[PDB]
Structure formats: structure tokens, C-alpha cells
Amino acid sequence: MIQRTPKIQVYSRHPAENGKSNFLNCYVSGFHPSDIEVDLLKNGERIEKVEHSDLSFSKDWSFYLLYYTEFTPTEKDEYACRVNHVTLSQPKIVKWDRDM
Amino acid sequence: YLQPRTFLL
Amino acid sequence: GSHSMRYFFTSVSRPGRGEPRFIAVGYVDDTQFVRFDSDAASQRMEPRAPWIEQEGPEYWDGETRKVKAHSQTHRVDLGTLRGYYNQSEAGSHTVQRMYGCDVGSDWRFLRGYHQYAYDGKDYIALKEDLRSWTAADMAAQTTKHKWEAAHVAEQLRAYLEGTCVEWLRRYLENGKETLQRTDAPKTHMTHHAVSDHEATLRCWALSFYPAEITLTWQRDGEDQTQDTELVETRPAGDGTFQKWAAVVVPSGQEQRYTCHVQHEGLPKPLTLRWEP
Ligand SMILES: [Ca+2]
């Protein structure tokens, strides 16, 4: 196979306000092949109720998926997206920055 | 509406 | 202007045990409306947009029959290409297919597509004339000879210029409340101090549809790309899209900088400026 490494963005659906229910998103794209492991983390711990979009691909044949969960941001809680793929020698963790 | 014919590589 | 219907097919061989993983998704423009997954319980073509659920049982029986037959075609294709490329049965390989049609601003046929990849590289593609093939290598050349002799392009032209356009128009009328609604980006700018000497202006575009957008920075009315950053367009999760672009500027000079937003849902492009 030609292999391509995933791009990763971690972001909320809506502007993050503490105490207001929201969606946490991890958008993985630009990767080949399609097999990929994606977790959302709360304070370093895997979240259970995470769903994902149906596999699709871009004009260049590279795959994309959205992983997401409902959440309510608080001041103290940290979130991150953890991705593993054949192109990565170890899992990649990308922290949620609420300004990005 | 999917295409209804068969094309094999 | 333009609308499109596209189908995307992925088939992944499983040498360890069992049949290929097969996933099919259908889109109108940037709205997914159907899916099939060989590993799901239903073994049915399933709705993924409310407006397709008004299709009756004859529609779902026909799309299920076709999508299951597609899955068998791509299973066979995996074996065929393993052979053409002289590959062992030990590895996992991927066949991808996309086909569909565009209609223009006049609501008539504009463009057709029917194209494949193997292990993420171009294999064979129907050219824009819908008359001839682009074969990337001598394996695809083998398919191309076969397909020329069997007049596959002529058979596909009838679907692409005909059936494909008729069904796209039917979907656009029955999903019209959402599919023919443009959602203009909701825009604002944020300001973040990097030092005592410089600041980041970030231009946000939120909750827009369709996904196609352009954000550009100007300084004193000239395009600027130096000291800018952006993000790829990303799904909000609710069917809309998000994007941002940023520029680093000397503190106190924010008013020189304008963010320009172009989108189908904006009659005129927007210009944002840090005045607030
Ligand atoms: Ca890995």
C-alpha cells in the first residue's frame, strides 16, 4: 500500500462555556489505509460513549472520520484525542485547546 | 439511487 | 448553481479470517443520506438523513439488492487485483470506488464520474468525455482493454447523464428544506496577546453549509500570507462546517488587518476588522 499519516483536530461543536452541554470532536483525515484507533480522553482516561461517522474519503482517496461525544466542559477537566494507525510508531495524543 | 449493472475490474 | 450525487465504496481484504470489510456511503452535495456496512446487523441500505426516510419499501429493497451486489463485485475485484499485481494472500489491500453526477446552475447534467483506487493510488477513471479511460499502470490497462471491448463507458453514460440526474433532482426536491438551503458562516474575530509586542487575530467561520469556503487576510488592502495560519475545514457534527484563519500582528496595528470571507450563502463577501 501507499500509506498516509492522519491529520488530527480536537475541538468543540459550540463555543466552550463551563457548565453548558456541548460536543467534543476529534476529526481525523488524510490517512491510508482506513484501519485506525481513535479514543477521546477525559483527564487521561478513555471515554466510553464515543460514536463516529461512516467511513468516507476525499478526492485523493485518503479517509476521514469524525469521532464525537456529548460533554459539559468544566474549568478543571482536560480532554484529548488519542490516535493510533499503522503509520505511527506510538499513539499520538492531541490536547483540546478551547481557542482552536 | 445506485447504478444497476455489473462491471468487474 | 451546482448540485452533486456521489457514492463512495471501500472494500478491505481480511487475510486472517472472513470476507472483506465493505462500507458504502451516498451523498448529495455535503449531506450523507445513505450507508451500508457489511459488519452491521441490518444487512440493509440504511437512511442517514431524515428526508430519505420517505422513500417506500420498493426503494429500500432495490438499494439493498444493488449495494449487496456492489459488495460482491469489490470482493471479486480484490482477488483480481491481487493477481494482476502478483501479490501474496498474506496482506490486507483496499479497493475504493466513487461514482456520481453533477448538475449545473441550469439544473441539467454537468459532469459524470466513475473511478477507482487500489491501495490508495489511482487505478482507473472514466475521463470527463465519458468516452475513454485513464489507466494508471499495466494492471489498470488490462481492465481498460476489457471495458473498451464490453462498451462499459457507453453503459455508464446512460446512468450518469440519465438515471443519476433524475434521482439527484428527486432527492433535491424531497430534501429541499435542507439540501437547497445555504447556511452562511457565522463570523467573528478573537484577539490573543503573544508578547508585549505582538498579538494573534483569529477569524472564525462557524456553522456554514456547504463546506466550500475561502478566508483571506489583507493588510492595508493587500493579500497577506506571511505570518498567517489556518485549519482545514472540519465538520461541526450537526451537518455544518467550521474553519479559521489567523494572522500575527504588531500590537496596536490590529486595525490595518481585514479578514475576507467568501461563501455561497453570502450574497456579498464579508470583511471583518478588529474595531471591537
Ligand atoms: Ca501504530
Numbering used by the authors:
A (entry chain B): 0 to 99
B (entry chain C): 1 to 9
C (entry chain A): 1 to 276
Sentences from the paper on this structure:
We studied the prevalent cytotoxic CD8 T cell response mounted against severe acute respiratory syndrome coronavirus 2 (SARS-CoV-2) Spike glycoprotein269-277 epitope (sequence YLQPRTFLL) via the most frequent human leukocyte antigen (HLA) class I worldwide, HLA A∗02. HLA A∗02 is an MHC class I molecule that presents processed intracellular protein antigens at the cell surface in the form of short peptides 8–10 amino acids in length for inspection by CD8 T cells. The dominant Spike epitope was narrowed down to residues 269–277 (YLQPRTFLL), and T cells that responded to this peptide represented >1 in 10,000 total CD8 T cells in many HLA A∗02+ CP with the majority of the nine donors using a TCR made with the TRAV12-1 gene, suggesting a potential shared or “public” response (Ferretti et al., 2020). The Spike P272L mutation that has arisen in at least 112 different SARS-CoV-2 lineages to date, including in lineages classified as “variants of concern,” was not recognized by the large CD8 T cell response seen across cohorts of HLA A∗02+ convalescent patients and individuals vaccinated against SARS-CoV-2, despite these responses comprising of over 175 different individual T cell receptors.
To understand why this single amino acid substitution had such a drastic effect on recognition by many TCRs, we solved and compared the structures of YLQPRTFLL and YLQLRTFLL bound to HLA A∗02:01 at 1.67 Å and 2.0 Å, respectively. Comparison of the atomic structures of HLA A∗02:01-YLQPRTFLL and HLA A∗02:01-YLQLRTFLL showed a largely preserved fold, but with local geometry alterations at the epitope residues 3 to 5 (Spike residues 271–273) which presumably form the majority of contacts with TCRs.
